[PDB]
Each structure stands twice: as C-alpha cells, then as structure tokens.
Amino acid sequence: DDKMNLDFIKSKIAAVPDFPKPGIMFRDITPLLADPQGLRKTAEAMAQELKNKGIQPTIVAGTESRGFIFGVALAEVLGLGFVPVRKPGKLPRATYSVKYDLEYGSDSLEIHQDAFKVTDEVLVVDDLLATGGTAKATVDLIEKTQAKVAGLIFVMELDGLGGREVLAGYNVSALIKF
Amino acid sequence: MNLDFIKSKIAAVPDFPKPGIMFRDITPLLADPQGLRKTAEAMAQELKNKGIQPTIVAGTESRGFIFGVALAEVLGLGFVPVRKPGKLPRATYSVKYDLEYGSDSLEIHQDAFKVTDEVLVVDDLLATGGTAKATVDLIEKTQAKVAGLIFVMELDGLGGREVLAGYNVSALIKF
Numbered sequence A: 001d002d003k004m005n006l007d008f009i010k011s012k013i014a015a016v017p018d019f020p021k022p023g024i025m026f027r028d029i030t031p032l033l034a035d036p037q038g039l040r041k042t043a044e045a046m047a048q049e050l051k052n053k054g055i056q057p058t059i060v061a062g063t064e065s066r067g068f069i070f071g072v073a074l075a076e077v078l079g080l081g082f083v084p085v086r087k088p089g090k091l092p093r094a095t096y097s098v099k100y101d102l103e104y105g106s107d108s109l110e111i112h113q114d115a116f117k118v119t120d121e122v123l124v125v126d127d128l129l130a131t132g133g134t135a136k137a138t139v140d141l142i143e144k145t146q147a148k149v150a151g152l153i154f155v156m157e158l159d160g161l162g163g164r165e166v167l168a169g170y171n172v173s174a175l176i177k178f
Numbered sequence B: 001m002n003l004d005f006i007k008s009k010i011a012a013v014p015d016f017p018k019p020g021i022m023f024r025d026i027t028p029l030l031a032d033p034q035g036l037r038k039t040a041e042a043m044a045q046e047l048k049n050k051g052i053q054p055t056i057v058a059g060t061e062s063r064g065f066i067f068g069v070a071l072a073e074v075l076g077l078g079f080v081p082v083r084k085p086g087k088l089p090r091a092t093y094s095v096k097y098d099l100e101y102g103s104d105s106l107e108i109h110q111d112a113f114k115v116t117d118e119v120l121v122v123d124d125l126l127a128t129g130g131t132a133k134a135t136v137d138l139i140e141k142t143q144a145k146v147a148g149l150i151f152v153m154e155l156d157g158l159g160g161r162e163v164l165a166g167y168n169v170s171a172l173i174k175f
C-alpha cells in the first residue's frame, strides 16, 4: 500500500527541461496539485514516513511559498497548527530574521518571535530539498524561538546537491529522490 | 460561534505596514490547531448556502495557497496555484494588476483548467481587488468559468467587491 501511494505521487510530477534556465530540469508539482487526491495522498505519505520514524511534531512550519502548500495539507492530516516562514517585510509584529546564501547574493526569511512555544517540536515542510539554504535558515529561525526542530520532510530531494549534509544533525525525510 | 472563533484569532496590528494602516494578522488563526479547518469549513458552508459548486480551487500566491489548500481538501477538489511571475515552468497566461506604483502580474499554466471547469478563487483578503480581478481574467483566458471568489476577510469601502462586479463574492468577516 505504501509503494502504491508513493507510485501515485511520483506519477504526477512532471519534469520540464530548461527551467528556470537552460540545463535545469524542473520538477513540476502542478499535476499533483490538480488531482483531487494529490495533496491528500502526499500529506498521508508524509504522515506515514513520520510515524515509521517515531517523529511526533506539535506544530508545522512551511516557507513561503510551496512550504505553504504541503505544510498546510500535512498539518491538516496531523491535527496540528501551522506557522508561515515568510519573505522579509510581510509579517506584522515582532520578527526574527536569518539570511541565507544564493548563488549570487543573499536573501532572508522571517518568523514571528512568538510563532512557537518553547515546548514545541516543529516539523519543517517544503516541496523540494536542493542545496538546503532556505531549509537551514528555517531551522535557525525556529531555534531563535527556543523551540526545537522535530525534523524536516520534503516531497522531493535532489541527489548530490548537499542539502542533507547542510542539515546534518536534523532528521530529514524526502518522499522521492531525483 | 465559528465566525467568532475565527475573528478572535485575527490580531489587529496598528501601524503596519506603515503609520495609519490597521493590519489584520492571520498568524494566530493559522497556529491554532483548529484555525484552518474551521475557516475552511465555514467557507464550504457559505458556498453551499449560495449554491456554488466549483470543480477546482485556485489559490492566489501566497496566502491564497494557505486557505485554498485547506478549502480544496474540505471540498474534495484539486488545487491550482495562481503564481507570481517566473515561477510556473510550462506555458502560462499572464495578467497585469496595479500596485501603489507600477504593476506586477499573476500567471497560471495554460493547461490549469478545462473549458468545462467552474473555478473557485480563494484568497485571505479582499482589499482593492487588484489581484482578484487579474485572477478572474486569467481564468477566463482558459475559457473555463469563474464559479465564485471567497475570502476570509473583506475591508469595507476599499472597492474590492465593486471591482469584481458580475462575480459571486463571499467573505467570512468584514472589517
């Protein structure tokens, strides 16, 4: 049944050549999203992996924006709250901020200082693990609140781009690997 | 009781983004373990009370992805992201909307909807309606139909509803 669910999720991810630049094979979640069971089966597969691993978060965090999609769907399945990790300048009350490296330049993410209780074990959700830059900035952000990271889970991991190493010391799951 | 619960988790924040504006902050609603499911359930009740039976949900990047996903799940429907520019990888339609100064765009994949779809737009807030109207227009470039638009919140007097003249508009709460 787990292979079967995983095969369904895999069967809805398109591969798109040369996007956003030449040479990059883009992994496209839109057909998964569009299917009436796509999000639900994805979030149920995520819950199964977490259960297998004994990971029991208290709340879910997602980054702007595809963290919002899968994070909200997973939060629903687990009966948990959700916290947005936003681009800078969007959150209205006091925030923490963490800068991360891009190929050229840098950027930041923020969370409300009060987003997590100090007893929270936070599950980070996102679509795709590549370099792990925004995932690590997310972990740092959570830790600023004094809450603890329960783990990180992705729909997809890109083999060999170093994300999982960047996230050493944290439990990392990914449903599909490319 | 349900609407009151949702209202009670939308914090009022003075002077954001700038002196004078009263910001309506959904974060405490999102953090509550029942905030999103209650919100989605209240939206689904509204749509049944108005006879709107969409075939697919479109959520506006980025807070419409939050409420859109939640409501799509309650409805048993699929979800289409309406995205900021340069994010969707396949052939897209594009529509411009006005910002304070200059403009920006929203995109959808040209294959996101069929001619037979009846699309529900979901977003957190109806303010000027700039983005919501661009979304309607995107939808209509596919020749699918707009079933309706639903928002958590509507800001009274900013003209949003009027910009969306001719479409079925619902908002859970008016501020």
Ligand SMILES: Nc1ncnc2[nH]cnc12
Binding pocket: A024, A025, A026, A027, A028, A128, A130
């Ligand atoms: N190759 C890729 N496909 C889809 N999303 C991405 N985000 C970063 N790299 C990506």
Ligand SMILES: Nc1ncnc2[nH]cnc12
Binding pocket: B021, B022, B023, B024, B025, B125, B127
């Ligand atoms: N006043 C407001 N409060 C919350 N979100 C908004 N988006 C635009 N105006 C807003």
